[PDB]
Design brief:
This is part of a larger assembly, with five copies of chain A. Chain A is an alpha/beta fold. Chain A folds into two domains: 150 residues, Enolase-like, domain 1 (2-Layer Sandwich), CATH 3.30.390; 241 residues, TIM Barrel. Chain A contains eleven helices and twelve strands. In chain A, the strands form two sheets. In chain A, strands 4, 5, 6, 7, 8, 9, 10 and 11 form an eight-stranded mixed beta sheet that branches. Chain A has a four-stranded antiparallel beta sheet with strand order 3-2-1-12, with helices on one face. In chain A, helix 2 crosses helix 4, helix 3 packs antiparallel against helix 4 and helix 7 runs parallel beside helix 8. Chain A starts with 9 loop residues before the first strand and ends in a 7-residue tail after the last strand.
Chain lengths: 391, 391, 390, 391, 51
């Protein structure tokens, strides 16, 4: 109509493959049951997929983009499956586009890698919407509910996190249930040593990276009771969310969290049912994107379950600033020693906002879209997906 | 900072008081218990509150407005309580402004009248935001998930509704539980007559306006089984949603709906819990506004429960077009005979979209904000709320 | 020394393989939208393509299997999963599954990467049978029956009946967004089939994930005089909980699911509550034969029939071997749905096909899964090597 | 057919009867209620059945065999009942032969003695299968999931277990509920001694041989809370597995196990239902055989419940090495002192693998079938069962 | 520390109750009450929103 804005449609979509303690220190993993896969996270293939970037161009030549893990496979699906839904569409139709992509990929999807593809496309749409409107994304999804974003820090050195101004520190659990009682005692001593370094009052959380079981979790938490661990994250496989009832029966005054490896509003509904998890912790680059996360967050708020997303850079920041039920978030200490903070996406972007003092403000986010500009140095690192269709 | 759009803050807020079968025909109500209150709906005071209008003016002089039921005590609360949170605020801060207004009014609110005040402010905010942006509200809340909105019609003549091309007709139940087995027999014959008037194929739904109980509903539904009633609406008091389990135990192939007189995300979580309700039916002018409605809709979407909100003009149309789980919409045949459709806000606007052929399109909603302009003839009728503060 | 020295895995190779099913009226999750409801290809049911994995042992015995998954599946084979396989004893089926499942857990658990694991696992079992000169069914518990009885999936259950199949499964044409007209037309579609085949021939209805609880309850009510044998995949695999509500409404009516569910953890939910009369795993999709055997055993503790998706020999060797596996599906993949073609087309020369509606143990008495690649179709095998040329 | 192996069918079946602290020390039993059955385990008749051995012969002359408890009435049932199913059959038909035997014996079976007869026959089938193929049984049922079997040791001297190199020690509970509060404090002292003897780090488990009740268990466990007991085994009658819910309500951080006197996949589904048992512990010679234990393990694996079967020689070892959910197992200290480890079937076999250092490896199992060759010295002791059928 | 000082001022035996004026949540209530276990607080009042 000639009463309202003639918003640009989607013209073209392009995709690109992007060419220490995190892989080389002791971390308990689903694959730590086997001797040759426990010393190194790369050995069983944590870094297998790599990273990709999706650009979406509108008819006015505005380009929105986003990045995520998924790599070559992800890029293949962008063009082969999902592009048909996007070309010629109005980018403001985020509800319809998500549902179309989710429901059309349902026979091979619902969880896992196809939904990571969907997420990154969705984030690129939101980037595009911001950039057309000359507005930051957080201003399009409900405003700011706070002025300051508080952060906890994830890494092997919570003394560093404390020094930098983060309110809490998150350490990886080193040993898995297959290390037996000796591994359990060593886990206790690892955590004891961190509590003693930071003092009695600094929040310590423990990441268990999907690696434990019910019995082990119960035995481990019981042994650590005087350490005052703030929460225990991802104790069980995401296949066994039911086990949290049995953990809560044993430890009902202890906080437990999960959800980094769960997907869609249907996945997260089970996490909120029964109320056995104190925080749900979705990854916006993984679950379905920002449109779906907004639905996850509204479901959790109905039960007053905090949503504290996985460190996703600006993709999580705009979300966190905007919601009633989203109190703080994760930053990764992604320096080799774990003692300083570096940009989450490396030298891919120029203008990444970094919480050097353990926080960010709304002003830090006041750039169009998700506020990221590709480093024109690292444009040469962006390998086009063209070769994957050269059959 | 200067990278992004400089959005106008809220300058001023003004509030105004607005100065047949629906009241006079046989309708079963909560007050149908007692002899002098069952003949007329006005007698016990369905019309008691009256109507009010809220304007919100921005610093660039853009005005957004919304109307609702509430009248004089609603206007009182606008300025006495809720104005303080709003003046000087960014109108994009919808999440914040709601959470403040709700949690501040929690000592006398949560349900009912003060929440209706919050709804109208929120809707006026959305109107303003659409107007500044030169965009319809629906293009701001997720876009269009469909091109066409299909309408059923509420009133005493569903043959009329059939003739107008509405897909269904919703008739009100004439007789209450206290009219006994005679009243039930007359209820059955009432519904039987409508069925043979419209023939075997046309959807008929029955509105019980909060007025029945578990045993009576079960009896009435049983007696009407071969009349193929599509759904039974608001059979119980909103005080006893728990009875819907017992009703579903008796009649599990039969469709039951409720929610018109329920409020907040926390009210509606009950109704989605049992999955004993086939549709939930919030009133947007009543539940807390569009900002809260979107959250209710997201919770319901995780369970694939349809939200088909109350007939609220453009405020529900923009919502209905935008969601995955919002398949169709109510219109009320608010003519005296029930045989034509009238504008829902009467004289007040010049350009209400009305589905005179039983449907609306996205093109009908393609005007800035909620797309209503006040009729300048009716501007005499709106009386400033100043007098209510002259103590 | 006293025991056989079994060959270890030497190498792994992968290859991309280069109508009513796509162009008739079928209800689908994407039937919500006008542009995606006439065609099944439009929203991309055919998107992934097919792939084949060969596994070669140190003695030059080659095991293989094929599935859907195509180029991104191949990619995953060499990039992720090959590291667990080279140099391993192929008899270690339990260890190799657990490694592959738990290594891929951060991006896996359901969907595409599990389809990858499945085909790898099936190829391992092919190899194991081939080394031992034995059919797979003789390695996984023997024959519990002599005869596999088939039902037929397709739009012509009269053709099914005539061909010797014991039952016929039809696709539901219209979705819940077609409204009450769609429901009436659905009822009419099913009446026509009941009337054509007569009162005693079993018909079952494939709903392909497309419905919701309320619509399913209404539709099943309207068809009650038609004596539908079962209703298959009424809900999204995201909402298996809804079957409690459906069974509350219709406890005498049979409901099935499980085609698009994955792993022993996914399937346990479908057995809890016993709201599903049959579970229907896809062996090429769920995790493979190693995991299917575990799903089957779980189910058998509660006497739930497991009746797999049509997967050719990969399901036949399963179905013949288990106590709780009473029959299975064949897909009528001729264009008219009036005859039976091979499931994998022209890729193999020696597919067993139930032209008279059954198979025997004798039909399955070939080494491994009993499939031999057509050397005319070997030129269609595109090597996956182009996908790593970055 | 002519394309595959021509596999030998079963030609013949033979059965044979085989002609300290465990019977004479303080152990709590179900029969410890009464004075004259308290001091001696033989007095109420633990030894009453005796042992038997079944040989299965194929048409190529290959013989598989297995041994278990059951003795004369077991041998009776082999030929009277079960022989009819086996002669002429393919021994690869393990799935057929179990269901046939089980469902045909259902009228007097399901649990107990006839199921023991089923187990031994099935174990002799697997031995034959391994022997014909020239492969160990574990390489036929899933391969090795681990290189090492770790053992804990069961008997009255855990310091002996510790020294021999077993990772943990399981002691029998001396006194029953009918020994009163004095018996309770005696039980507590027993256990406090053993904790003192082995020190604070060494795993101690307690066998309660079906002998306790819910209230006793709850009181005894609470009284031993300082003694960090690893698990409490078979506290309840196998008839009262529902009581574990009540025990876990009192003691949710304590581990409890059972299963030794349970039978079939249907018996065990109950134990995994509700997840009130940390470990299930079937006896492979008792529950229905290897074919059925494979199905029990799979059921348990879906809920990540450890199966740690009763000590049954190579019959357990091949199973334990093969499965994802089977972390260690049991060896019994079957010396008179309880201070050394001896073959579980005594002098019957020449080559029984014994974990003298508290472990076994996959190399130890690398003999065809279950790896047991029968001692021709002990071949005189095998009484043929023919006398039982001379009426 | 607020509540410990009140326990100490009135001594061990006098009943003290805590009004939380609808202001807490489940996690914080559970944590707070745990932290105050030796204070023998008699009851905790309106910890949760009436919603």
């Amino acid at each position: 109509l000639s009463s309202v804005k003639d918003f640009p449609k989607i013209k073209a979509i392009r995709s690109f493959i992007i060419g220490h303690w995190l892989i080389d220190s002791d971390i308990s993993t689903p694959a730590s049951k086997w001797e040759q896969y426990k010393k190194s996270r790369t050995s069983w293939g944590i870094n297998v997929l790599g990273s990709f970037l999706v650009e979406i161009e509108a008819t006015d030549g505005t380009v929105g983009f986003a990045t995520g893990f998924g790599g070559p496979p992800a890029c293949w699906l962008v063009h082969q499956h999902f592009e048909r839904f996007l070309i010629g569409a109005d980018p403001r139709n985020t509800n319809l586009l998500f549902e179309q992509m989710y429901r059309a990929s349902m026979f091979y999807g619902r969880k896992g890698l196809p939904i990571a593809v969907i997420s990154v496309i969705d984030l690129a749409l939101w980037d595009l919407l911001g950039k057309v409107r000359n507005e930051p994304v957080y201003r399009l999804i409900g405003g700011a509910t706070k002025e300051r974003l508080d952060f906890y820090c994830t890494g092997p050195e919570p003394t560093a996190a404390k020094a930098m101004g983060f309110w809490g520190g998150k350490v990886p659990l080193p040993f898995c249930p297959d290390d037996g009682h000796e591994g359990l005692r060593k886990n206790v001593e690892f955590l004891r040593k961190h509590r003693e370094a930071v003092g009695p009052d600094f929040p310590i959380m423990v990441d268990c990276y999907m690696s434990l079981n019910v019995s082990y979790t119960i035995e481990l938490v019981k042994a650590c009771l005087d350490l005052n661990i703030n929460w225990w994250e991802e104790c069980l496989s995401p296949d066994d969310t039911d086990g949290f009832a049995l953990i809560k029966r044993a430890h009902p005054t202890v906080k437990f969290t999960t959800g980094e490896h769960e997907y869609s509003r249907y996945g997260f509904r089970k996490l909120v049912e029964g109320r056995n998890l104190d925080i749900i912790q979705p990854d916006v680059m993984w679950l379905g994107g920002l449109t779906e996360l907004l639905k996850v967050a509204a479901l959790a708020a109905a039960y007053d379950v905090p949503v504290v997303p996985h460190a996703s850079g600006p993709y999580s920041y705009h979300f966190q600033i905007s919601q009633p039920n989203t109190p703080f978030q994760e930053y990764l200490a992604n320096s080799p020693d774990g003692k300083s903070v570096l940009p989450v996406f490396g030298d891919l972007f120029i203008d990444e906002p970094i919480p050097t003092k353990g926080y960010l403000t709304t002003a830090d986010l006041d750039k169009p879209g998700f506020g990221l500009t590709i480093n024109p140095a690292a444009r040469a690192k962006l390998i086009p997906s063209d070769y994957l269709f050269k059959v």
